[PDB]
Structure formats: C-alpha cells, structure tokens
Amino acid sequence: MKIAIINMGNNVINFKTVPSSETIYLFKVISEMGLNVDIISLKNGVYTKSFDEVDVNDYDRLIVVNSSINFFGGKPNLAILSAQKFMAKYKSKIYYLFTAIRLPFSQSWPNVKNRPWAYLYTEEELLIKSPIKVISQGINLDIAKAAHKKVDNVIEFEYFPIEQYKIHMNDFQLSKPTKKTLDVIYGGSFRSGQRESKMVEFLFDTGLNIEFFGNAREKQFKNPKYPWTKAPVFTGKIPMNMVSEKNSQAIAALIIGDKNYNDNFITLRVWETMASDAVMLIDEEFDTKHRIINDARFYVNNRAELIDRVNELKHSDVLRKEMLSIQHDILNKTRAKKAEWQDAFKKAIDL
Numbered sequence: 133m134k135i136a137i138i139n140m141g142n143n144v145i146n147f148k149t150v151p152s153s154e155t156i157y158l159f160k161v162i163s164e165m166g167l168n169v170d171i172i173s174l175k176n177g178v179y180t181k182s183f184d185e186v187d188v189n190d191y192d193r194l195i196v197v198n199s200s201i202n203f204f205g206g207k208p209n210l211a212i213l214s215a216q217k218f219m220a221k222y223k224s225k226i227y228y229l230f231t232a233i234r235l236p237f238s239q240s241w242p243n244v245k246n247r248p249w250a251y252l253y254t255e256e257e258l259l260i261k262s263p264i265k266v267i268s269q270g271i272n273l274d275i276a277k278a279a280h281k282k283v284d285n286v287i288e289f290e291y292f293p294i295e296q297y298k299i300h301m302n303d304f305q306l307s308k309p310t311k312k313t314l315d316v317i318y319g320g321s322f323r324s325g326q327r328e329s330k331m332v333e334f335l336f337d338t339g340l341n342i343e344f345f346g347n348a349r350e351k352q353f354k355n356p357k358y359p360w361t362k363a364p365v366f367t368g369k370i371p372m373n374m375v376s377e378k379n380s381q382a383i384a385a386l387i388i389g390d391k392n393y394n395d396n397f398i399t400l401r402v403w404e405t406m407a408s409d410a411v412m413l414i415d416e417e418f419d420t421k422h423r424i425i426n427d428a429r430f431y432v433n434n435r436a437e438l439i440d441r442v443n444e445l446k447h448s449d450v451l452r453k454e455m456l457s458i459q460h461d462i463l464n465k466t467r468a469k470k471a472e473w474q475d476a477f478k479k480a481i482d483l
C-alpha cells in the first residue's frame with residue numbers, strides 16, 4: 133500500500149514556509165507510523181516527487197493539507213491548479229486535513245472559469261468529483277460543517293488532533309534551560325478580527341520587553357477599534373523547525389484565541405510553547421475549561437493579568453521552573469499516548 137499527501141495550494145520544499153512545513157511534518161509522522169507515504173508537489177525534491185512523474189491512482193489513499201483556492205492578483209497559481217488537477221484524476225475518497233478554519237475545501241473551477249486565462253483549463257481537468265472526508269482539527273464538527281456549507285461532495289466529518297505532529301516525531305526533544313532575553317514572546321502571523329484584537333491586548337502597551345517574530349508587521353495593526361501606542365519588536369519569519377528554540381529565549385510565550393478556535397481547536401502553537409523553555413500563558417477565552425493544563429496560573433484574562441503573571445515569573449525563578457516542570461510533565465503525558473494517536477489517525481483515513 134502507498135499513500136500520497138499533498139498541499140492543495142502551496143509549493144512544498146522545506147521549512148521556509150508554514151504550509152510546506154506542516155505538509156512535511158505530517159509526511160514524517162505518517163511515515164514513522166509504519167506507512168508508506170510520498171509527498172507529491174510541483175517538482176522532485178528532498179521531501180517530494182512531482183505531480184507529473186507519478187500517477188495519482190497508483191496510491192491507495194490521497195491526503196490533502198488544506199489551503200486557499202483563491203487566485204492572488206487574479207493570476208494563475210500553479211500550486212492550486214496542479215494540486216486540484218491531481219485530485220480530480222483520483223478515483224477514491226480524498227482525505228482533507230482541515231487545520232485552519234479559513235481554509236475549508238472548495239472547488240477552484242468556479243474561480244478559474246471567470247478569469248481571462250480560463251481557456252487554458254477545462255472543468256473536467258479541475259472539477260474534483262471524488263467523495264471527500266473532512267478531518268477537522270477542531271472537535272466541533274458543527275463549525276467544520278458550517279465552513280463547508282458550500283461544497284457538495286463533502287460526505288463525512290471526523291475530529292482528530294492533527295496538530296500533535298511535532299510532539300510525536302521520533303526526534304522530538306523538549307527545549308533545555310535557556311538564557312532569558314525577553315519577558316514575553318509570540319511567533320506568528322497577523323489575522324484581523326478577534327486575533328488582532330487580542331494581540332493588541334496582550335502584546336501592545338504592556339511595558340514589558342516583548343518580541344513578535346514571524347511575518348507579522350507593525351503596519352498591519354491599524355484598526356482604530358483596537359488602539360495602541362507602543363508596539364512589541366517585530367523580528368521576522370524564521371523556519372518552522374526552530375520555533376520552540378526561538379520561544380525559549382523568553383520567560384513566557386502566549387497562546388492567543390480567535391473566533392471559532394476557542395474551546396474547539398488546539399493549535400500547533402500550544403505544543404511548540406509547552407515544549408519550549410518559556411512558560412506557557414494561555415488566553416482564558418481560548419480554553420475556558422482549562423483543558424490544556426488544570427492550573428489557573430497558566431491562564432490570563434487581560435493585559436493586567438498578563439503583566440502581573442509575567443512579573444511574578446520574573447521575580448521568582450522557583451515559580452518559573454515549577455510551571456515549566458508542570459507544562460513539560462503534561463506534554464510528556466500526551467506524548468505517552470502516541471500509539472493511541474497513531475491508531476486514531478489510521479482510523480481517520482480508513483485504516
């Protein structure tokens with residue numbers, strides 16, 4: 133048996149981008165699960181084979197990492213077009229890994245037919261008719277189904293904690309004690325709405341030494357609904373395989389909520405922070421029942437709480453190390469259920 137995993141709208145090569153990284157990590161955990169898998173992308177590479185050098189129907193399972201189908205600038209996007217062409221030729225059920233709420237499966241043909249370059253493609257080439265199974269990272273299938281209310285062939289939905297792929301890797305390692313150069317740190321991208329609101333709340337005008345790494349930029353926070361005066365330091369996007377090491381430079385790293393993610397999704401960030409040398413502080417709204425760690429000290433409601441909690445950590449090395457000890461213990465407990473996680477995944481993809 134052979135499995136093919138692809139990203140539906142982003143080229144895959146290495147850890148330079150988040151979409152590529154997530155695809156490679158899934159490829160790795162699936163492979164270490166004792167399954168034969170190939171990542172199929174635009175060209176052959178260390179981790180990939182090209183769409184044109186293989187036959188999609190030589191694979192028994194087709195797994196697709198979610199992506200946007202929108203064509204930036206109205207121009208063609210070969211990753212999207214090539215991926216869907218690949219998917220359309222497949223004659224068995226397609227397993228869609230739904231890791232981000234804003235990226236539900238959708239047909240690209242409707243977008244293509246109205247473009248000047250539509251004549252270069254056909255409905256037959258791009259229209260994916262095979263049945264699709266949405267594997268939601270969020271436990272709430274109502275939200276998952278609501279996101280796919282416009283797709284016809286999406287037959288089934290099933291929850292699976294996809295984001296644990298980093299902790300289950302064969303070469304996973306907790307971060308070790310690190311020299312502290314920051315009070316708080318957050319590595320990610322900007323997103324309008326609640327996420328933007330909370331980034332301002334917890335990262336702006338705190339009076340703390342805070343760094344915001346990733347491709348996010350200060351110019352993106354201009355919503356007058358969320359005013360601020362002093363912003364954290366933005367330092368640039370780094371490879372995804374160095375996130376925990378980066379988080380470790382700070383005393384604490386934040387988990388910030390967002391609409392439809394709260395009390396539904398556990399995000400990769402959770403494990404990257406928990407595994408780092410930085411104390412994990414969680415936006416209360418994101419996990420109201422303290423499902424991640426049953427210790428109120430790891431949660432903060434607002435800017436006031438965050439500042440107080442961070443100052444408490446800065447002045448008590450014992451509190452800091454105790455909390456790290458606690459989050460690391462909880463993480464190991466999750467890693468202990470590796471076999472269960474693997475069997476659950478296999479079940480998700482009908483194995």
Ligand SMILES: O=c1ccn([C@@H]2O[C@H](COP(=O)(O)OP(=O)(O)O[C@H]3O[C@H](CO)[C@@H](O)[C@H](O)[C@H]3O)[C@@H](O)[C@H]2O)c(=O)[nH]1
Pocket residue numbers: 149150154231232233269295319320321322345346347368369370371372373375397398399400401404
């Ligand atoms: O310089 C940086 C900063 C961030 N990251 C990575 O980017 C990820 C995503 O960050 P962000 O873009 O802020 O999105 P999140 O809302 O934190 O998480 C989204 O992306 C995760 C990874 O796919 C999913 O688990 C979540 O469900 C999805 O909402 C992080 O976890 C890091 O692994 C980097 O690789 N380099």
Ligand SMILES: [Cl-]
Pocket residue numbers: 232233234235
């Ligand atoms: Cl999203």
Ligand SMILES: [Cl-]
Pocket residue numbers: 372373374375376377404
């Ligand atoms: Cl990492």
